[PDB]
Amino acid sequence: QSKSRKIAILGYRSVGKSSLTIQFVEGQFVDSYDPTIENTFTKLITVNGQEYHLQLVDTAGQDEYSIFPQTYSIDINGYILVYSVTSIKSFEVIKVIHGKLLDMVGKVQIPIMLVGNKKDLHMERVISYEEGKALAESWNAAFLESSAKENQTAVDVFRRIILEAEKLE
Ligand SMILES: Nc1nc2c(ncn2[C@@H]2O[C@H](COP(=O)(O)OP(=O)(O)O)[C@@H](O)[C@H]2O)c(=O)[nH]1
Ligand SMILES: [Mg+2]
């Protein structure tokens, strides 16, 4: 009576893909972590009384020139696209990543969740909550800001993509 889902985490380098995922999976804010390796974490979570077996694909990250690997579109039930609120570059790149993703999958009307990470770095913020929300609305995607240092924000992100998936289902 369990349900397995595979979620791919995408985004520009250093926006916090690994840190967010690991904060969710192990409940800890890791300080150091290999900058390039693509790894698939496993996580068990019960949402709405429903148990889920999650496979979280923490990708190596991509940019305007990346050529999406097949592993980005096979058996993926949902995608989390993250950018850093401290980087306009990561924000402009997440738009390109979204476009490439739609090109690679087609019109599958895939479940997508946009995430503006690093919200704790108040001083270095350059992307507003409104800009992030406007983008998500442009895509009709879920939206949330987060901080790999605040476990509850990381949990909300993953719970949210699960609901988006169920909704599009
Ligand atoms: N302050 C702060 N630093 C973060 C956050 N998320 C990631 N980082 C830091 O940003 C750097 C890159 O994070 P990492 O997860 O490796 O990025 P990735 O390449 O997107 O997976 C590391 O030095 C992290 O400690 C966050 O929410 N807040
Ligand atoms: Mg990483």
Swiss-Prot record:
Gene3D superfamilies: P-loop containing nucleotide triphosphate hydrolases (3.40.50.300). Alternates between an inactive form bound to GDP and an active form bound to GTP. Inactivated by the TSC-TBC complex via the GTPase activating protein (GAP) domain of TSC2. Autoinhibited by Tyr-33, which constrains the active site conformation, restricting the access of the catalytic Asp-63 to the nucleotide-binding pocket. Specifically inhibited by NR1 (4-bromo-6-(3,4-dichlorophenylthio)-1-(4-(dimethylcarbamoyl)benzyl)-1H-indole-2-carboxylic acid). Mg(2+) binds at S18, T36. There is a cross-link at K6 (Glycyl lysine isopeptide (Lys-Gly) (interchain with G-Cter in ubiquitin)). GO terms for molecular function: GDP binding; GTP binding; GTPase activity; magnesium ion binding; protein kinase activator activity; protein kinase binding; protein serine/threonine kinase activator activity. Changing E51A: Causes slightly reduced phosphorylation of EIF4EBP1. It is an enzyme of class 3 (hydrolase). GTP binds at S14, G16, K17, S18, S19, V30, Y33, T36, N117, D120, A148. GO terms for biological process: cellular response to nutrient levels; negative regulation of cold-induced thermogenesis; oligodendrocyte differentiation; positive regulation of oligodendrocyte differentiation; positive regulation of TOR signaling; positive regulation of TORC1 signaling; regulation of cell cycle; regulation of macroautophagy. It is found in: Endomembrane system; Lysosome membrane; Golgi apparatus membrane; Endoplasmic reticulum membrane. Small GTPase that acts as an allosteric activator of the canonical mTORC1 complex, an evolutionarily conserved central nutrient sensor that stimulates anabolic reactions and macromolecule biosynthesis to promote cellular biomass generation and growth. This is GTP-binding protein Rheb. It comes from Homo sapiens (Human). The lineage of its organism: Eukaryota, Metazoa, Chordata, Craniata, Vertebrata. The gene is RHEB.
